[PDB]
Write a protein that binds this ligand. Sequence first.
Ligand SMILES: OC[C@H]1O[C@H](O[C@H]2[C@H](O)[C@@H](O)[C@@H](O)O[C@@H]2CO)[C@H](O)[C@@H](O)[C@@H]1O
Ligand SMILES: OC[C@H]1O[C@H](O[C@H]2[C@H](O)[C@@H](O)[C@@H](O)O[C@@H]2CO)[C@H](O)[C@@H](O)[C@@H]1O
Lengths: 282, 278
Amino acid sequence: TTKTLGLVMPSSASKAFQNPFFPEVIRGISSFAHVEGYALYMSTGETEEEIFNGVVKMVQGRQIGGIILLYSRENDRIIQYLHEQNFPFVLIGKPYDRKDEITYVDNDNYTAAREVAEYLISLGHKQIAFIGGGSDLLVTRDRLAGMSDALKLADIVLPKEYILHFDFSRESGQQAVEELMGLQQPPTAIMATDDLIGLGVLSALSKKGFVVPKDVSIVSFNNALLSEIASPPLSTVDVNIYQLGYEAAKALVDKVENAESTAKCIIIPHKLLKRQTCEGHH
Amino acid sequence: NQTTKTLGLVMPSSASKAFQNPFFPEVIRGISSFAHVEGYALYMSTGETEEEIFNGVVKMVQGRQIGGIILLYSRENDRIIQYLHEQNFPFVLIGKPYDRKDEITYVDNDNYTAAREVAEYLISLGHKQIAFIGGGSDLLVTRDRLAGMSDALKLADIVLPKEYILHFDFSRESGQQAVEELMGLQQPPTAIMATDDLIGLGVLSALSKKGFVVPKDVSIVSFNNALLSEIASPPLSTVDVNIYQLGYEAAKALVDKVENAESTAKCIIIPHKLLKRQ
Ligand SMILES: OC[C@H]1O[C@H](O[C@H]2[C@H](O)[C@@H](O)[C@@H](O)O[C@@H]2CO)[C@H](O)[C@@H](O)[C@@H]1O
Ligand SMILES: OC[C@H]1O[C@H](O[C@H]2[C@H](O)[C@@H](O)[C@@H](O)O[C@@H]2CO)[C@H](O)[C@@H](O)[C@@H]1O
């Protein structure tokens, strides 16, 4: 037997490592793999087809004992594959369906986003926008869902033009600001589902001569080191990336070694850190 | 050599209504079932009053025989949790804990979701008025199951009276006096959600006693799939929470805590399932 664990990204390891979420999740993954003498393995394919092939060779090689998926996408072929080959794997993120069958690690993203939206609403904001990554990712749907419900519960409208999907990058944050700040009735607060987008939102808002947070409040997610040092420092939700990783690996090795298993879900705590990007609105 | 190997279950009062609730046998089933895999025996507290129980825990730790502790129930302002945390003693908790969720390891159902799910079901049947009977209010599970439903309705735009809301103690008797109370006002809801199978049973029987035909007159859903649930009348609408697995997953968690010095606090979430036999 060989103990190595496979890691699967949502895209090229090169795109992934530009996002500080990933080195931190891997850092948690590794910290545990160490405890049980497991090593790590990832494929290099950039393309979706290439990433599939990647996972397939992993399973075909009989050298990988288990696989951690660092993401959760709707209709992931990767999951259809692993489920059919009966290969041991674990999610970081809610699965679209079969919660009962799949073992996953996640934050309560629905509630984190609800809480962020409650936070802004208690601040008197009534025109609140959401900027996320892919629609097809479940962390995005959930984060959307929680802020959305929070708005409907306080009787606050959420127009289609305040909901944005882009990839997670700074540029995304800049195009969002173009779109949002370009409307006839723009938002006064903004929730970004990723610090990269937060950081970009900030620069873009500042290139246009706005001031955060007097003109626009921003909350974002993930606590990137960069968020601490942004000017002004970003309110963000710490989502405990490392523990997501550590706990994912601990769940997988258990699944692999025990080999008779029950599927559970593991919820790692989040924390809203209010730094400097939010101001009162009343 | 060198092995002791046993876990401590902080039991409810022997004279409490909770001891007799089916939730506990089933949770102990899970606990013993996993405990057996690692060869842990179970030791249980016998106290009746809150002080006696507290003493028991102090005895458990002090004796140094017992590896870790499971708290079967969740009390507010909790003293035992405080003492345990201070003694650096590994413990796990069935149910959400009001405070320090971040600092404790616990095992739960997504009760808020389940309640929402239940509500959306009834609406789909499309019931204008829905009422709620809960075990008394402080326990979180009640608060969450309340919130879940109260939200789905609000989203729905259905309205909750504050008379559709009740709160009395997890007893078959409790579910009796509620049916008498609820059919008491000018409007009868025609749907109900109860947070406990005992309550659900006294709800089915108190409206047999009044000449109301379930499901066609009044529709009922209740939690926990006691499986007293199957027996009762027409079989129910129930949310089955796999209590066995709560117990099992709680033990797995503690044994890990006991053996590997695992600090990290996480919530472990057991899947639920809305069966519908009304
Ligand atoms: O909340 C847990 C969450 O972690 C990961 O989500 C990442 C995402 O993949 C990254 O690209 C970046 O955008 O930040 C997210 C963290 O907030 C898992 O991919 C996701 O499935 C899971 O929900
Ligand atoms: O959802 C799991 C829920 O379980 C417990 O709640 C019990 C309660 O203790 C019983 O007396 C009765 O109300 O059945 C409930 C479960 O349906 C705990 O509160 C905790 O495990 C958790 O929140």
